[PDB]
Each structure stands twice: as structure tokens, then as C-alpha cells.
Request: fold
Amino acid sequence: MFKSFFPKPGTFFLSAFVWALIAVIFWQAGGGDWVARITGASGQIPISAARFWSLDFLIFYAYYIVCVGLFALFWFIYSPHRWQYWSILGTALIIFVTWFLVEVGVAVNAWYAPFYDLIQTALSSPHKVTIEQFYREVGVFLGIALIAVVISVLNNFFVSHYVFRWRTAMNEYYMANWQQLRHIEGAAQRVQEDTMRFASTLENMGVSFINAIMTLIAFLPVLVTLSAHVPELPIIGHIPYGLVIAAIVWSLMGTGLLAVVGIKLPGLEFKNQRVEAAYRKELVYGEDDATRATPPTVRELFSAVRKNYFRLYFHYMYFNIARILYLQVDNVFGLFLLFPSIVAGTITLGLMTQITNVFGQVRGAFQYLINSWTTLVELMSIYKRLRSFEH
Amino acid sequence: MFKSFFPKPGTFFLSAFVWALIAVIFWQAGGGDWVARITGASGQIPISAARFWSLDFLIFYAYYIVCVGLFALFWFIYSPHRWQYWSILGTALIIFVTWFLVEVGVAVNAWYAPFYDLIQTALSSPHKVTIEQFYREVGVFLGIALIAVVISVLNNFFVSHYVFRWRTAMNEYYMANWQQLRHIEGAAQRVQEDTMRFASTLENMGVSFINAIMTLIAFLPVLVTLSAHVPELPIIGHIPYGLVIAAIVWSLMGTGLLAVVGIKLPGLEFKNQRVEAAYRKELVYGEDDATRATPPTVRELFSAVRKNYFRLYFHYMYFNIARILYLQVDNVFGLFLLFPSIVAGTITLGLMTQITNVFGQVRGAFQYLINSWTTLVELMSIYKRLRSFEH
Ligand SMILES: CCCCCCCC/C=C/CCCCCCCC(=O)O[C@H](COC(=O)CCCCCCCCCCCCCCC)COP(=O)(O)OC[C@@H](O)CO
Ligand SMILES: CCCCCCCC/C=C/CCCCCCCC(=O)O[C@H](COC(=O)CCCCCCCCCCCCCCC)COP(=O)(O)OC[C@@H](O)CO
Reply:
């Protein structure tokens, strides 16, 4: 979103989007899924820690590396940059590792069904199963958990360094032009406080946002292949793709209509920060001179701070009305859609469980993003502050 | 935890704890649950929005008000304070509203079983149930959701004002003694940046922490009355209270052993903040004078900042190893405990579902607290900074 990284941001992102679309179209249905080496299609290793060593996953890794390599080799000659390696390859690696973690989560999800089957068989007929099978199954689960832990730790470490690299680039570029840039009010805050909060906020709210989109993309095909049993939606009528449209619309609206409703919030934190800077400057001048910490001026500055903060707190009531209601209704959205299908007698028990489980695991990814909306507000305010400062 | 609020913190908290214990003992089993007015015991209104109007809940509200009134009337004469009303009554009200929200959540939980029963009956025999019963049930759910929304909005608003009152008290008390307190390094940051972050962090991490303890206290009796079917724990032997000890130990260790493991983390953010202050001061001096923004000094300050931040990022690997592992194993802890009971053939199907559901809803409250551990680290660092500054 900046110019310190990202060699030419005007055309870099367009090229990234176009190339991503071309590659995805080629792989998914473009007939590019032909595997001449070894037939790993229509058959995969069962649930175990070796699931990530079969030739299918190796082929996917190779394809991803080839695509990223072509893109990077184009851009490294089209337009050189000092931070090119981080700005391109680190982003690619972060996206890849997030996808890998979603896959590991799906594997843990799949491991549950046979264990429940074994438990049910033990409860019904006990002379078939012993304790050894249980210990073996727990061993397999620990095998998956170890890989999850190992990848997650390094993911966090690399994300931290990448974000700090971004902060270094921003600070260097601002301080390069400090002479004609200090005349703006609150200049000292822009380059240090704002950059720190941007780094810390993006380290926390960036991974979560990519993870939700990845979860939706991962679970979409199951709803595509399962929406043949739901022909009607409650107050819509009859659409050809029942569950996919419902899920996409629900998630997109829950993320976007809240932003539209609370569009005025990020414009208040701005003013809040300004008044606080006007406060802090005085104290910094007062830490040496004894004549600059007089009571009345401190009184006036704190009075202004209070007056702005009260208005900010006031403008959260009509946002919380929407957010809390959306959270409350979301728990039964996946069961609301099935009223006409039950009375029509089309669906059966067990398929209801599949739909409900899928919708629940989809909701789990956006729950954390919605529950922490103050951080997004702070990030958006930081974006506006830096953008206004850049001109 | 301070002296600006809380008239005499040395003896106030001890009195609060003792009085809370006395009241709880009197009500729970002290025989104080006699209701001479109307017999609401051993019978309650079914699942509806009127559940919070029966004489049982009114009696509880009256008892709570009487206890808080006695305590406040004692302290308002024992030791006067300027902020007494906020410091006592606001805390009481916040705790009460959190309990109320947990109760509403329990009601929504209970509403599920009959709806599934109706759905199953519709699936088996369709000539009994029509669409009107479904619409009525959805109406009842909306009735509960409305109360949830209305209470939550005002809860957030009041918490915001109470926290800002705390910040006002702290700032007034520090600025009262500014002359002999400015000689400490980084004084300007203590009174403005640290107070702001303390307010914003406590507004977010305070409610979540109280909510988890309230959830545990609410669900404890069910495990007390249900642990008669589990006589053995996996590698423990035979204890008289199976599930209660397991739940309490699991939650307490997951919250506390992580803190013990990462005890060294809060001591690093301190230094981080110091170096950043040493940076910002220079820029604030440079916003007017043109001879104080020389490149080399900025270089040295940023070099120090980078050197400290790298060490901080390094010390998260061995903390994430524990945190991610704890999150990963927690998903199957409630099913691990039941291996000996299944092979012993004591428990039956359906009771397993109850145990698993209870443990899942207990885990849901601590999941949000564990997933956001950076905020707790920041809060603890703020506490240490202010405590060191106060002496
Ligand atoms: C202003 C607009 C800005 C837009 C910015 C964003 C632009 C767009 C983002 C793209 C990143 C994500 C790419 C992948 C998206 C799709 C996600 C995904 O999982 O796709 C897989 C296929 O992917 C594929 O073949 C696709 C391969 C794509 C390879 C990479 C190409 C783009 C490189 C970009 C470099 C960084 C650029 C700068 C970013 C900021 C599906 O596999 P599938 O389930 O069948 O299982 C196969 C096997 O493992 C057996 O299960
Ligand atoms: C250094 C140490 C510091 C320690 C600081 C903390 C000190 C301790 C905290 C206490 C707050 C919470 C009190 C309540 C704790 C127990 C929580 C609770 O829900 O207790 C209920 C009974 O409570 C009761 O009778 C108890 C009534 C207690 C009334 C209030 C007394 C204390 C007032 C304090 C004022 C603020 C002081 C300063 C705090 C910072 C159970 O009902 P029950 O499920 O049977 O359903 C009945 C009916 O509704 C039908 O279901």
C-alpha cells in the first residue's frame, strides 16, 4: 500500500491480481491438473502426518514455486528496488504458510470421524476393541499436532521480522525528507508512534484476515458439491447455488456492512491523536524548563482531550447495536436456511449435521475478526494519518 | 490496584474479599436460600424472555443490592474519598452485569434442546408439526436476543466511562506532584502514553478475564452433580471429585503456567519503551530548531531500537512453543479423560455428549484470552512502568 516497498505500487498490484487469476484458472479447471508423474488424484493417503509427503502435495509445492519464480524474475528486471526480496518473496511465503496451516486444521478435523466410530463400537460391543487402538489413535493425533506447532512458531517469527522491515523502510523514507516535512502539525508522532502502532497492529490483524479468506476458499467446494439437496432458500425463492451464495453473502456483508455503518469512527480517532500530541509536546518541553509545566495550560489540554473522548465513546452505541446483534443472530443462521427443506422432506438427518458443522467452522474464522474491531479502527486511523502526512 | 481510587487499598481489598466470602457462604449452603415470599425453588419458568422476571431472580437482585449497600455504607463513613462512588459502585455494577450476560448465554444454550426435538419429530413424522411452531420458536429466540443486545450496549458504554474516570484520577494525582517527579527519565511518557494504553488495554482485557471466571463459577455445579459416573481419571487413579478438579486444574494451569513460562517477557517491553522515548524526545525538540534533526543521531537511536526489538522477537519462540501446543491439545482434553470409563462400561452414550458440551463451552471463554497474549504483556509492562515511576 506504500512506495518504500513494492517497486511501483500503481502497476505491481494489478500484475499480481492478473497473474493470480491466470494461475488459479489454469490449475482448478483449466485442465492443468494432469499429473503425468504419479496418479495421486482420486486417491490420497489416509489421515496421518505423512499426508504432507505424497506426490500430490509435492506437485502443488512445485507449481507454486514455479509461478512465484516467474513473477519475481519478471519484476526484478522490470523495475529494481532495494527491498524487493522481502516485499515480494516474504508476502508469497506468508500466504503459502497460512494455506498450509488451514490444511493442517482440515486434517485434524477429518481425524475425528473414525475415532467417534471406534468409541461407538466400544460402547456397543466391547469384545472387539482394546486400549491399544485408542493409544495408537492418540499417537497419530500427536503426530499431526507436532507439525502444527513447528510451522506456527516459525510463521510468527518471520511475520515479525517482515513487519519490522516494512517499518524500517517507512522510517528511512520519511526521515530522508525531514526538512520540508516537519512543518506539518504533529510531525514527531507520525514517524515514531504511528509507525510503531502500524507495525504492531498489522502483525496481529493481518494474519487473521488472510486466514478467514483462506478458510472460505478451502471450504467452498464442499458446499458446491453439497447444495444439490437444498433447492429453496427461506425468503429468496429458488436459486441454482444454494449454500455457496448464502455463505459468501453472509460473510461479506458481516464484514463490509459493519464498516459502512461505522465509516465515521476512523475520522474521530484522528482528532483524538492530534489533541494528545498537542498535550505531550508541552510536557516534553517541560521536562527541562521549569516554567513550561504551569497548571492552567495542562488543565486546558486535558479538558480538550476529555471533550473529544466523550464524543468518541458516544459514537459507539449505534455501532455496537449492529455488531452485537450480528454476533447474536449468527449462531442460528446455518439452521435458519433449512426450514423449507425439512418441511419438504428432501434432506435427511446426518446431512443436517454436515451443513451445520461446515457453517460453524466457517463462522469460527470471522468470530475473532469481528470480536476485535477496535484494532481495525486504530489501523484505519493510522492509514488515514500517514496518507494525509504523505502529501 | 492504585491509591487515587480505592480509599485505602491496603485494607479495602481484604474487606472486599472477606465480605464476598461471607455472603457467598451464607447464600449457597448457609441455609440462607429460604424464600418465605413465594416458592420459586425446585421450579422455574420455561425458556423465555420472562425468565428474568420470576421471583427467584428478583430475590437475587434484592440480596445483591442489600450486600453492596451495607458494604458501601460502611466504607463511606470509615474513610471518605473523592471518587468513592465510581470506585465502589461501578465495580459492583460491572461484575453484576457480567453475571447477567453469562445467565442470558446459558438461557440461549438451554433453548437448543427442544428445537432439535421438534426438528427430529418433523423428520420422523411430518403430520404432527407445521410451520407455525417453528415460527413461534424463532420468535422466542429473538425475544432473548433483544435483551442480550440491550444489556451489552450499555455495559460497554459504562465500562468506557469508568475506565476514563480511572485515567483522570491517575493523571490528576501525578500532575499534582510534577515538580519532584519530572527528574525521572521518560516522565512525559508515563503520564500520557502509559495512561492511555492502560485505559485502552483494561477496557478490552478486563471484561474478558472476569467473564471466564464467571463462566467457570456458573458451570461448576453441573460437573459437581455429574461426576458420579466417572470414578477414574487416566493417570491419576481414583479421586472423589473427578470432573471439577480436572476442569479447575486445566484452566488454572493453562492461565498460570504460561505466565510463569513467559515471566521474562514483560521485562523487555520496558526497555523497548525507554529507547523509543529517547528517540521521540529528540524529534520533538527538532520540530522547531533546525539543528537538532541531524542524521547520525537519528541513526544511532534507530539502531538501538532495532537491537532491542530483535531480542524481544527472539524471546517469543519458546513461549509460542508452549502456547500453540496448549491450544492444539485442548481440543481433545475433554475426551481424553473418558478412556477408562468407556472400557469400564460405566458411562453411556448421551452422557458423553453432555460432558463434551460442558467442557467445550468452558474452553470457549479462555480461548479468546489465550489467543491474545500480546495485550496482557503490554498491560503487565504498563503496570511495572507505573509502579517503578511511583517510587
Ligand atoms: C489491488 C489488488 C491487490 C490484490 C492482492 C492479492 C492478489 C491475489 C493473491 C494471491 C495469493 C494467493 C494465491 C492462491 C489463491 C488460491 C488459494 C489456494 O489454495 O489455491 C490452490 C491452488 O492455487 C493455485 O494453483 C494458484 C497458484 C498461485 C501462485 C502465486 C501467483 C501469485 C504470486 C503473487 C506474489 C505476491 C504479489 C504481491 C502480493 C501482495 C487450491 O488448491 P486445491 O485446494 O485445489 O488443492 C490442491 C492440492 O493441494 C490438493 O488438495
Ligand atoms: C486482594 C484481593 C482482591 C479481591 C477482589 C475480588 C473480591 C471478590 C469478588 C466479588 C464479586 C463477585 C461476587 C459474587 C461471586 C459469586 C458469583 C455468583 O454468581 O454468585 C451467586 C450468589 O452470589 C452471592 O450470593 C454473593 C453476593 C455478593 C454481593 C457482593 C459482596 C461484595 C461486594 C464487593 C464490592 C466491590 C469491592 C471492590 C471490588 C474490586 C450465585 O447464584 P446462583 O448461581 O446460586 O443463582 C441464584 C439465582 O440467580 C438462581 O439461579
About this structure: Chain A touches chain B through 73 residues (CB under 8 Å). Residues 131-176 of chain A form the longest helix (46 residues).
